[PDB]
Amino acid sequence: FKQSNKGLYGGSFVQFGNNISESKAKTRKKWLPNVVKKGLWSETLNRKISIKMTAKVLKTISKEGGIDNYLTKEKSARIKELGPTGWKLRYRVLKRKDEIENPPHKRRRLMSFLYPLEKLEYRSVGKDLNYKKFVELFADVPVKDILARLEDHKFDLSTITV
Amino acid sequence: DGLRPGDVVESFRRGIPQTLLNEMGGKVDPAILSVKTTQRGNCLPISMIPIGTIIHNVGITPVGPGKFCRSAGTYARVLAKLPEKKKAIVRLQSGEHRYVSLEAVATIGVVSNIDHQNRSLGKAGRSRWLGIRPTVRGVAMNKCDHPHGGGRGKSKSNKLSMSPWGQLAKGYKTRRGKNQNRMKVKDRPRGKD
Amino acid sequence: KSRGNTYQPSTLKRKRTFGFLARAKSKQGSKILKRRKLKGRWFLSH
RNA sequence: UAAUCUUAUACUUAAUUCUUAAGUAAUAUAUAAUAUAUAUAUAUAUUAUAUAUUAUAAGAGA
RNA sequence: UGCUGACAUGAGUAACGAAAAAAAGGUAUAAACCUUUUCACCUAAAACAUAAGGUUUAACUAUAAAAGUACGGCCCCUAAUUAAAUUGAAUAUAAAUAUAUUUAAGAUGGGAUAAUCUAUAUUAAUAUUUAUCUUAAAAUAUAUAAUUAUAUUAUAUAUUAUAUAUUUAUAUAAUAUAAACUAAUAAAGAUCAGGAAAAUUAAUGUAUACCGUAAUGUAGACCGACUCAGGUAUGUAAGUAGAGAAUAUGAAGGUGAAUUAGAUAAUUAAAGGGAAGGAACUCGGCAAAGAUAGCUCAUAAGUUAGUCAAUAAAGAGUAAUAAGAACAAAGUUGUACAACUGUUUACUAAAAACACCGCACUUUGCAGAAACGAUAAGUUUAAGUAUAAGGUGUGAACUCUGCUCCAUGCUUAAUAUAUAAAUAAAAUUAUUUAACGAUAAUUUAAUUAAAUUUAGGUAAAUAGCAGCCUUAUUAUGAGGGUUAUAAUGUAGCGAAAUUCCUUGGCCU
RNA sequence: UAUAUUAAUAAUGUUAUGAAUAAUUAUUAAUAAUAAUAAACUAAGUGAACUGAAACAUCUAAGUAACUUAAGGAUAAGAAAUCAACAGAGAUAUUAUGAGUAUUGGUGAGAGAAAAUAAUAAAGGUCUAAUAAGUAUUAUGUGAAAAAAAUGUAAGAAAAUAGGAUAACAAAUUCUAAGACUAAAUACUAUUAAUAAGUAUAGUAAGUACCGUAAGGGAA
Numbered sequence A: 001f002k003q004s005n006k007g008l009y010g011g012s013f014v015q016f017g018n019n020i021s022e023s024k025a026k027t028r029k030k031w032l033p034n035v036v037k038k039g040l041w042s043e044t045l046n047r048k049i050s051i052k053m054t055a056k057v058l059k060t061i062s063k064e065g066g067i068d069n070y071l072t073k074e075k076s077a078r079i080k081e082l083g084p085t086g087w088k089l090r091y092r093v094l095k096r097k098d099e100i101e102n103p104p105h106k107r108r109r110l111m112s113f114l115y116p117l118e119k120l121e122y123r124s125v126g127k128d129l130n131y132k133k134f135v136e137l138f139a140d141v142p143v144k145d146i147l148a149r150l151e152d153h154k155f156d157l158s159t160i161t162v
Numbered sequence B: 001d002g003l004r005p006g007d008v009v010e011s012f013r014r015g016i017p018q019t020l021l022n023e024m025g026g027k028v029d030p031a032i033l034s035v036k037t038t039q040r041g042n043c044l045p046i047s048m049i050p051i052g053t054i055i056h057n058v059g060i061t062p063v064g065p066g067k068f069c070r071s072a073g074t075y076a077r078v079l080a081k082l083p084e085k086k087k088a089i090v091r092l093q094s095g096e097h098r099y100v101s102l103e104a105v106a107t108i109g110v111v112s113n114i115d116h117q118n119r120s121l122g123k124a125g126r127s128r129w130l131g132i133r134p135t136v137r138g139v140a141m142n143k144c145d146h147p148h149g150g151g152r153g154k155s156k157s158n159k160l161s162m163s164p165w166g167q168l169a170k171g172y173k174t175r176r177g178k179n180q181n182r183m184k185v186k187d188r189p190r191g192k193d
Numbered sequence C: 001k002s003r004g005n006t007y008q009p010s011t012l013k014r015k016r017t018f019g020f021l022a023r024a025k026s027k028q029g030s031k032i033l034k035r036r037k038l039k040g041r042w043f044l045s046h
Numbered sequence D: 001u002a003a004u005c006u007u008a009u010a011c012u013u014a015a016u017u018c019u020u021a022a023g024u025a026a027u028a029u030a031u032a033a034u035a036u037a038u039a040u041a042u043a044u045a046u047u048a049u050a051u052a053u054u055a056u057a058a059g060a061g062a
Numbered sequence E: 001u002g003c004u005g006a007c008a009u010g011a012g013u014a015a016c017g018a019a020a021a022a023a024a025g026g027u028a029u030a031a032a033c034c035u036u037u038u039c040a041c042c043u044a045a046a047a048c049a050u051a052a053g054g055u056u057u058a059a060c061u062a063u064a065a066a067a068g069u070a071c072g073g074c075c076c077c078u079a080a081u082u083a084a085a086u087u088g089a090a091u092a093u094a095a096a097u098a099u100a101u102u103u104a105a106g107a108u109g110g111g112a113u114a115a116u117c118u119a120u121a122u123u124a125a126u127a128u129u130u131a132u133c134u135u136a137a138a139a140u141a142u143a144u145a146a147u148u149a150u151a152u153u154a155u156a157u158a159u160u161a162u163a164u165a166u167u168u169a170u171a172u173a174a175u176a177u178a179a180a181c182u183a184a185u186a187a188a189g190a191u192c193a194g195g196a197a198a199a200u201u202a203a204u205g206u207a208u209a210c211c212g213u214a215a216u217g218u219a220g221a222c223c224g225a226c227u228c229a230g231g232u233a234u235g236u237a238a239g240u241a242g243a244g245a246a247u248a249u250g251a252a253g254g255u256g257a258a259u260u261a262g263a264u265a266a267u268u269a270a271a272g273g274g275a276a277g278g279a280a281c282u283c284g285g286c287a288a289a290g291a292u293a294g295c296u297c298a299u300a301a302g303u304u305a306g307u308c309a310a311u312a313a314a315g316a317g318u319a320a321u322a323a324g325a326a327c328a329a330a331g332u333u334g335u336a337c338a339a340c341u342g343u344u345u346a347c348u349a350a351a352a353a354c355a356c357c358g359c360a361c362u363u364u365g366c367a368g369a370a371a372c373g374a375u376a377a378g379u380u381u382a383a384g385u386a387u388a389a390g391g392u393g394u395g396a397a398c399u400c401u402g403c404u405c406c407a408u409g410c411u412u413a414a415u416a417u418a419u420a421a422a423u424a425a426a427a428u429u430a431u432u433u434a435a436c437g438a439u440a441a442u443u444u445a446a447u448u449a450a451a452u453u454u455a456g457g458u459a460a461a462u463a464g465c466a467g468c469c470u471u472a473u474u475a476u477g478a479g480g481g482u483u484a485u486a487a488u489g490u491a492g493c494g495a496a497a498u499u500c501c502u503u504g505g506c507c508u
Numbered sequence F: 001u002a003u004a005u006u007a008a009u010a011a012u013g014u015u016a017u018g019a020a021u022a023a024u025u026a027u028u029a030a031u032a033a034u035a036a037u038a039a040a041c042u043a044a045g046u047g048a049a050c051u052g053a054a055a056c057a058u059c060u061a062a063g064u065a066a067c068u069u070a071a072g073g074a075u076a077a078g079a080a081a082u083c084a085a086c087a088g089a090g091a092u093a094u095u096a097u098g099a100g101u102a103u104u105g106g107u108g109a110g111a112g113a114a115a116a117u118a119a120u121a122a123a124g125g126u127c128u129a130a131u132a133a134g135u136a137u138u139a140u141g142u143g144a145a146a147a148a149a150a151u152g153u154a155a156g157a158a159a160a161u162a163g164g165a166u167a168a169c170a171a172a173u174u175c176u177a178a179g180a181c182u183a184a185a186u187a188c189u190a191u192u193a194a195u196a197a198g199u200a201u202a203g204u205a206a207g208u209a210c211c212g213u214a215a216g217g218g219a220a
């Protein structure tokens, strides 16, 4: 039911069954869920999410206090209910929540100073060095030793400023 | 109708131009806009067209192109204006009075080729040139095809006048119920002439 | 009129509508390509 | 009518390009205060606070 | 009427598939293969070049030769169209997948240079189809700058003699058959209103890729079971003669056949002639025969005014007055049906049937009707807008289209009106607990539609348009009375393609 | 142009005008990509008709054929909101008795369990959840021939002092839904070995020849 993958259907699904006349004649019919396009508000994303959802999930969202709480329910039932689209959104909500709660500092400049020294060293021996390779090589280095340049400070990437 | 090579026509959908704007003392004050307001060829919003004027190329929305009375010799007449509701009643060539937004495009005059309807093709080939293929009557069909078909000799099968796919073709209104025109004052005269 | 001459040859049409790529580049074409292969046929397509 | 529905189109730190973030530039909206001009109200200017950098325009509308 | 294999009978019978051949020699081996000569057939082809196709069948393994300048493909560009391709979330959808936008592919098409032979790369800057009419003028013939008649209306390159940069190019002046035909601008008539896509300079540079190339290709070399009288695209297609690519011959070329040789019975097919009759034949002039110009004149009635009739029939002018190739050329009239040109049952019906231009009704106001969409997005309608589009019937035009909406529908107005679903609340009942309670059906409670009903309109919607008696002295009934219906057959036509009785009565 | 691009170098030529500079030859560092990859078994979606009923529509055929989708050597199921009856058993899968049994059907054609006892089976129980709500339940439309579990629309609780199970109620009994992993006995393919009151028209060719445009059919 690939139409469900594009929205939050809450596990809802199509049912194929029979229709019955007073003569008990049987003819096939389909039961389609009540799908409604609604634009809800996300507090952490600070923008209006707009996807097709069924009426039942919309009511469930109202009782759970917004889309953000709907997409962040631990109980397995919710995970199954949330389709591909819900999973990706959950990632957004959760990652953004972590970013706000966990700032990076509770190196970019250092690598900027280090780059000209290394490129000159590589050019001296006849080789070259581009920024993308510089990042790739020095991605995993925790501490850059002071071979050249001057550490005219006591930062240590801790307690910035006074 | 009367457009000829040499005449001058202008459009006033943006509004009154600068030339008249600086001539307001001698242009708007004497209200000699009527000289150009009701002129053959130029296009005005229905708001500025006086009541009773014969107009064509009538739109529906202010930001839309003309859609009505574009065919040969067709014309429409402006009936009433409702500034409060931003709608104007425009008598339309079918005879149906329809609401239209006040600031809707409208060109004054009838459309050219009045005598188009009096033309007559002389042979079947002529039609073929314009892209009209033959039409086979239902009576000549077979029963599997058009319902009227079948029966020995000439017979209509005591079947109502129906389209091939099973829709009455004699006085049956197709647009019925909820899916109807929300804007119309009076229906077009069904008997027409 | 006389019949029997229904097959009028043309390499372009014969290859375009019955060729290997004419079947390898479609779901239905691939299905019959693999059906012939499973049966062991030597000449999969034109 | 922010129910629905249709139509058209800058600097700086922290993680070459991308992203977050305190500050300020400029635009838009809303509130409070001050000053001016007309019949408590309308219009304009300044100061301050809050938000934005999918929208705008047209149409139907419970 | 069993399956497979082998072998019989029909039977050494039918047949060997449009047809011209003969002698000599290769070869004291030839009707069938090769060569020479004679004869003949095809010749706007059975010839010469090609396209597609194909077991290379070819003049063959030692085999089909390309920088380009008329050499095509390849390559650039696109049409119709195609695409498991591209666009927290392009749209839609049980899957399959569909839709819209991009991108890519796709010739049956477009692509500068060139015999005085030409140079495609890199870098940098900035055109539907269709005709050449009339006047004019020059020049020519009879007549006297006047008049009659006449080839020509524009280009296509050689020679002679002069002027320019200096025997290479241009220019000038004079000379030079007729009929067809070719590509380029010119000019201009009609509506049926006539494809898409990919720059110039300046410098530098070019060592010329791959594939096609034979022969057959109106056929023994492809599609047809066959070395099949069938089907198959393009350009030349000598002359003589003609309006002509008709018809006659045939220069050159090719060719004369997997059947031959004798008499040609009865009989069969395709042809030629036929006395005296001339449709008596026959369902029926089926078949066959019939041509007194092919050019120039002339050409009636009717009529929608259109030499439609009409190529009018008969007739005339040109040598023919007994005839001497082939082709073109085959009368007049009345009636029924249909306006006409056209379409149809590949392979028994080509028509009176379909279509048609014309007439008429009706739906749709564009966010539309109609159609398609396991079903939607969406597409055609249409880049159109009531003089447009869809459906229906009739079917050019002259004279006309009378009557009635009873029935089936359509359409307008009426809460006149029942009923399904959906709900609360509240009364009796039943089962059970001892009790409150729990569970069940029942009935009351205001809040409904479409539908149905009533009254209209709609027949160029589907449809219908009766019956008895007797009155002007002998006939009939102009007329009078009768039942019910919505109406009661009007104009016209009438033994109709409509009439069994019927070969209806009368006339030609 | 991966015999490639960028950068550097030694030289040549070489422009530019000693140095530079690219072009070339030759070295070194960096910059990059190759999908034919089976069939059967399993699970899921959709889902016929012929036929039987001596007609036919409920019913059957049958959730079968067929199409589509996804994964593994297997997959599915699995440690009770299970059965049973006042006494008790203790996950799952397959086979036998139970049993053609209860049950069901235009009460036609027909369809048809469970408990319990046996056999194969493996160490066969064990936490991975902060103990599960638009969930149970109700109304309604569907939904394995008896036996429910699911599902469209909408309404919608409780905390072990609670909740599920039976037309209903009272007692009693039993279990804990909305969180999970799980060998082996099983299916299919291939290989080795053993046994053939099996095969020489089920004894190796060939999916070839040939037929059809194609899917496809198919010899001696």
Ligand SMILES: [Mg+2]
Pocket: B140, B141, B142
């Ligand atoms: Mg018929």
Ligand SMILES: [Mg+2]
Pocket: B143, B144, B145, B146, B147
């Ligand atoms: Mg029908």
Ligand SMILES: [Mg+2]
Pocket: C004
């Ligand atoms: Mg055949």
Ligand SMILES: [Mg+2]
Pocket: C017
């Ligand atoms: Mg095709």
Ligand SMILES: [Mg+2]
Pocket: E002
């Ligand atoms: Mg026998």
Ligand SMILES: [Mg+2]
Pocket: E013
């Ligand atoms: Mg015999």
Ligand SMILES: [Mg+2]
Pocket: none
């Ligand atoms: Mg004989």
Ligand SMILES: [Mg+2]
Pocket: none
């Ligand atoms: Mg014989």
Ligand SMILES: [Mg+2]
Pocket: none
């Ligand atoms: Mg001899």
Ligand SMILES: [Mg+2]
Pocket: none
């Ligand atoms: Mg000829």
Ligand SMILES: [Mg+2]
Pocket: none
């Ligand atoms: Mg000739």
Ligand SMILES: [Mg+2]
Pocket: none
């Ligand atoms: Mg030839």
Ligand SMILES: [Mg+2]
Pocket: none
């Ligand atoms: Mg292309």
Ligand SMILES: [Mg+2]
Pocket: E107
């Ligand atoms: Mg081409």
Ligand SMILES: [Mg+2]
Pocket: none
């Ligand atoms: Mg050739």
Ligand SMILES: [Mg+2]
Pocket: none
């Ligand atoms: Mg050749």
